[PDB]
Design a binder for these strands. Structure first.
Lengths: 114, 121, 56, 209, 127
RNA sequence: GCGAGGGGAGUGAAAAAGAACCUGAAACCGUGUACGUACAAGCAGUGGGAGCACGCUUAGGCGUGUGACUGCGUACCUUUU
RNA sequence: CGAACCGACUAAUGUUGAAAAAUUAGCGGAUGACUUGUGGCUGGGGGUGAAAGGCCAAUCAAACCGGGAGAUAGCUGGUUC
RNA sequence: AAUGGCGUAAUGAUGGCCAGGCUGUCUCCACCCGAGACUCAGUGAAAUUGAACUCGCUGUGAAGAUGCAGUGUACCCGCGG
RNA sequence: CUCGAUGUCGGCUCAUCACAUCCUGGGGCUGAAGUAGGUCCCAAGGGUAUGGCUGUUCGCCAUUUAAAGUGGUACGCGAGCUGGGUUUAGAACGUCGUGAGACAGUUCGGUCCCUAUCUGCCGUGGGCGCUGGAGAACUGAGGGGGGCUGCUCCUAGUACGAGAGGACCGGAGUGGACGCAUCACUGGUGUUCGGGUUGUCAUGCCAAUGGCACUGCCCGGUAGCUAAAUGCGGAAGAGAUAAGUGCUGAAAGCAUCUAAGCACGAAACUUGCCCCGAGAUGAGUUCUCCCUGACCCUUUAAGGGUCCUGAAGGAACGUUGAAGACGACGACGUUGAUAGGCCGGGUGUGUAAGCGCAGCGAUGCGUUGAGCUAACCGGUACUAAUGAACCGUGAGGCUUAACCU
């Protein structure tokens, strides 16, 4: 299966993720969502970022929201949320990826790295 | 979510900690997260309110660390443990408003009051 | 874990069945018209064909 | 009445908002019929099947010759079939990875249960309390100590003891199918499927009845 | 065993396996042949050859281990100066094994590993 | 192995008296040979009994060994109703 | 408060042990009715005892050794062609 | 009510109950690192033991049977647990 | 029957049977409208609660559930765990006694041994046998596993009902508990991968590294293994029934389910589904492969024996494995990817080392998302898998039936 089963993993991510996110991107990655009866709608979740660049299904990037109370969406890469497109918080990743320091406060995940 | 287990009120009239003492669904339901009905027990409460302290009632589960996922498989885990008591035998969510976010599965048909409040998800 | 009457004879003489030893069978290899041991070339000099261990 | 083929891993087709597609790639490479019998010295219907790239060069001998009975290309181990009113040695002697069996329906599979080798109570059941730390007396995993005192007993034959493990049949049953690409041999299911790339599987229609 | 591909061990601490295997690894370089069980042997080459590849660099890279894998930089210096450039051709592979077997007292296979000098050439008899 | 141990040769009436040394039994442990023996239940024998290995005889229907198959059929002692 | 030192509250292991009382992790006292080396003094119905019938050489509701002694045994066992 | 009565700060490896923290004690176990367990080479125990050709079931019977009766079943022999 | 020892109650673990059935299944009567019940018959497939108090069994109480069955199994289960109750020695209270002490009272403390020979089991190999020897694919006599059930909607707010309420039959979805498989997802682990950091010894020193201190402490994580994760299964359908229901029908001018004679009828029984399965000695079937050289002595149909041959195949060895305690089982052995190495990629860590510059310096920035990187994926014979040797033969017993020259 040089290029056969490992083949679907490829014939689907042909997308244009972010290719380079340095945390804190508080974007609502418009996520298709759904709602019922009508509405297709599309809304997202403000981010922080820590992922896993893996197994085709780049099922990750626990986006981290503090809206009112507490925590994460492990929003994959594969099709139903109209791209991560927006990266607003530049970078400055502490011990880089896997910056899981769940503790809400004046302890910014200081962004900015230009 | 197994007996014991401290759960917070996400609605009102009987603050803070609330003790889960059972899990319905039948014989041997070990857990129950997402948005199942759960027999609760108030242990703190604000001096006021119309629901005092130590009132064995049942309730729902709004935000639970165990997570909730579906579709794509992505998950929404809320590190908290939401109750939201319901006036017991004439089932219905007792209270006025709900606090914080809620779950999209919580919008389960027969419920509905709770989700038109707590502006979120 | 104690035992009680046990027959030295017959019994045991049966388990011994799965206890007999075994035979090899191997070659001599081109050079050594004998030894070669098992799947080895030869120990005399420890060479399969030349300078291996010690030889000419 | 169907074909068998090596499992070979499994993946999904993570739909946009789903991933429902959770099959398991089961390269369904066609077979080689031509071999069967009826009432003149044998059993019932039956139908031999063989598919793989066995080194016809050197490994298996008698079977290659046994295959000469009007066949083509000897693969691995041959399996049989049954009634269904199929073709025969009277037209070709070469099945395919698709015909009239239908589509979208559910197709059961039977990989080869791995085998964790010897296993115990706790293992072959996943049930037996106790501790470890202040224990060190009955340190959990024990059979948990099972039997009587002074009783007929017979340790009761068949009671779940340690036992071992190892390649074994299975049969999942059900399991719909999301896709298929004939010739290309690419059958998909929906998770499950026993074995782990090192099996064979029979992939039958669905003995649901 | 349990279920699939993992491995590499013999009764010993993996906390200490590094030494019981590194000193021995630095020996092949010091010499050529070393009788030491099919196990230690069949296991030895993964520390010798992988450390052999550090030739092409002959800079900071090769020196990823000098002051550590051996008190003296003897063996390491012997590498990027001799062993490295020796087998420069067919990179893959290197050390071979030749069964000796039977260790006296405790019937354990011996072998001894090697590396070059005895090229697989249809040589004749010399020296 | 300038071992142990042994094999010859010689001492001797004898070493089938070699220092472990007179005679050397029994338990117990082996090698060899004849027969029985891997679909059959139990104090293992006893009664019947074919076959097989040898031995019989100027056949004459036998002796020795072993025993397939088969009727039976729960050791001895003590203490006790 | 806490090492040495002295002691032994808990659990696991050991229980044909490493060990006829210990090992491992904790635990109590630690300038005192403290702790320890050497030598001395109390003798069996006797000693010593912050007292448990505890200790008096792996022995204690009366030490060990030798003797009266073949104590006695209306009991158990065994009893030979 | 000094074979003391009722209190009592302090102290307690002391008995009973509650709480916070804490957690594999538990729901419910998973993985991993080591010492055994397994395999090879060397050395080499133990208690026990009338004799064994040492199956299940129902009944029998000194009253809970591998050994009796009926019957069912079961090729021969190891190794791990 | 046991006193030359058969360990007590309760708990844990793990059970196995009965039926006098708790739930679910099928019926009869009801003072049965419906819904729910009452009772009796049939029925053992499967299922049959977590806690508070107490040593408890039990019980009462809180809250579930379709339901929280009764009982046998040395009041099942200590050469399997526990040691809370209860009989050792310590001490105390009440009470008894002049007292030693005692209690069918209470109270605090108080050593639970055994490496399994036989039967029995769970797994798993070695013989030999199935009549020439092999390699395979089956048949299926038998054997086991599995058999739970909630809620909702439609039917139908209909039948029924004064309303209140609310079905049957049949169907559709989603659950609880249980079972099997499997890591693609979510996660755990991941002392063999990367990083941070405390103390200290060393590699001459700076720098950079390494040993040790639980992997020193710690952050994260590949593969694999995994549950809390994911996917599927307890079904329909048949046969013959249980109770029950009946038809037609006399004995017994009617009647009658029965005596002749037909028909229904349950999670029980046979089967259907999954696994094992020809040692099924009653050793079955089918397909394919291999062996067609000479003599001798007997007590001659029984053979015994020598030389020449040795195939198909098996095994042995080696490289190994998602296979495994060892055996077994699978892959590969130069006609080669079977291991290891090597190339590339993935991944995980998180921007190395060195050099340059800024800053007194700690330190920072650039080189640079670098450096390193495993069990992984794609590929590559570099190393090791050597040519032979070993076992297994040489055309297959008699009798009869059918085919024949």
């Amino acid at each position: 299966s040089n290029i056969i089963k490992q083949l679907e993993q490829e014939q689907m991510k042909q997308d244009v993720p972010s290719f380079r996110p340095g945390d804190t991107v508080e974007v609502k990655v418009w996520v298709v969502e759904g709602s019922k009866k009508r509405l297709q709608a599309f809304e997202g979740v403000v981010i922080a970022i820590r992922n896993r660049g893996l197994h085709s299904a780049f099922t990750v990037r626990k986006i981290s929201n503090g809206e009112g109370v507490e925590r994460v969406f492990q929003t994959h890469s594969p099709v139903v949320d109209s791209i991560s497109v927006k990266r607003r918080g530049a970078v400055r990743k502490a011990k880089l990826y896997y910056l899981r320091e769940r503790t809400g406060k004046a302890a910014r995940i200081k962004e900015r790295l230009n | 979510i197994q007996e014991q287990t401290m759960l917070n009120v996400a609605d009102n009239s009987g603050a803070r900690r609330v003790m889960c003492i059972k899990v319905l669904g039948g014989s041997h339901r070990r857990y129950a997260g997402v948005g199942d009905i759960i027999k609760i027990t108030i242990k703190e409460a604000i001096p006021r309110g119309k629901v005092k302290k130590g009132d064995v009632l049942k309730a729902v589960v709004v935000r639970t660390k165990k997570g909730v996922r579906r579709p794509d498989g992505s998950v929404i885990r809320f590190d908290g443990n939401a109750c939201v008591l319901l006036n017991n035998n004439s089932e219905q969510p007792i209270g006025t408003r709900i606090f914080g976010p809620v779950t999209r599965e919580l919008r389960s048909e027969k419920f509905m009051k709770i989700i038109s409040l707590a502006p979120e998800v | 874990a104690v035992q009680q009457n046990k027959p030295t004879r017959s019994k045991r003489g049966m388990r011994r069945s799965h206890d007999a030893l075994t035979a090899v069978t191997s070659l001599s290899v081109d050079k050594t018209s004998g030894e070669k041991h098992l799947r080895h070339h030869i120990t005399a000099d420890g060479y399969y064909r030349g300078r291996k261990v010690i030889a000419k | 009445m169907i074909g068998l083929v090596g499992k070979k891993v499994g993946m999904t087709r993570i739909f946009t908002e789903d991933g429902v597609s959770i099959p398991v790639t089961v390269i369904e490479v066609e077979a080689n019929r031509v071999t069967q019998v009826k009432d003149l010295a044998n059993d019932g219907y039956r139908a031999i099947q063989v598919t793989t790239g066995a080194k016809k060069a050197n490994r298996v001998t008698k079977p290659e010759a046994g295959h000469f009975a009007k066949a083509g290309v000897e693969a691995g181990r041959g399996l049989w079939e049954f009634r269904l009113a199929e073709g025969e040695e009277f037209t070709v002697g070469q099945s395919i990875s698709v015909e009239l069996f239908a589509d979208v329906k559910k197709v059961d599979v039977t990989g080869t249960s791995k085998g964790k080798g010897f296993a115990g109570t706790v293992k072959r059941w996943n049930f037996r309390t106790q501790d470890a730390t202040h224990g060190n007396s009955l340190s959990h995993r024990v059979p948990g100590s099972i039997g009587q005192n002074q009783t007929p007993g017979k340790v009761f034959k068949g009671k779940k003891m340690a036992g071992q493990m190892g390649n074994e049949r299975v049969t999942v049953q059900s399991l719909d199918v999301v896709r298929v690409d004939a010739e290309r041999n690419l059958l998909l299911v929906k998770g499950a499927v026993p074995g782990a790339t090192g099996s064979d599987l029979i992939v039958k229609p669905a003995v649901k009845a | 065993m349990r279920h699939r591909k993992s491995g590499r061990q013999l009764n010993r601490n993996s906390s200490h396996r590094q030494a019981m295997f590194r000193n021995m690894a630095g020996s092949l370089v010091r010499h050529e042949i070393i009788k030491t069980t099919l196990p230690k042997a069949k296991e030895l080459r993964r520390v010798v050859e992988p450390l052999i590849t550090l030739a092409k660099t002959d800079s900071v890279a090769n020196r990823r281990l000098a002051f550590a894998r051996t008190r003296d930089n003897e063996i390491v210096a012997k590498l990027f100066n001799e062993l490295g450039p020796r087998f420069a051709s067919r990179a893959g592979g290197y050390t071979r094994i030749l069964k000796c077997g039977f260790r006296a007292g405790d019937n354990a296979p011996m072998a001894y590993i090697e590396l070059v000098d005895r090229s697989e050439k249809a040589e004749a008899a010399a020296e």
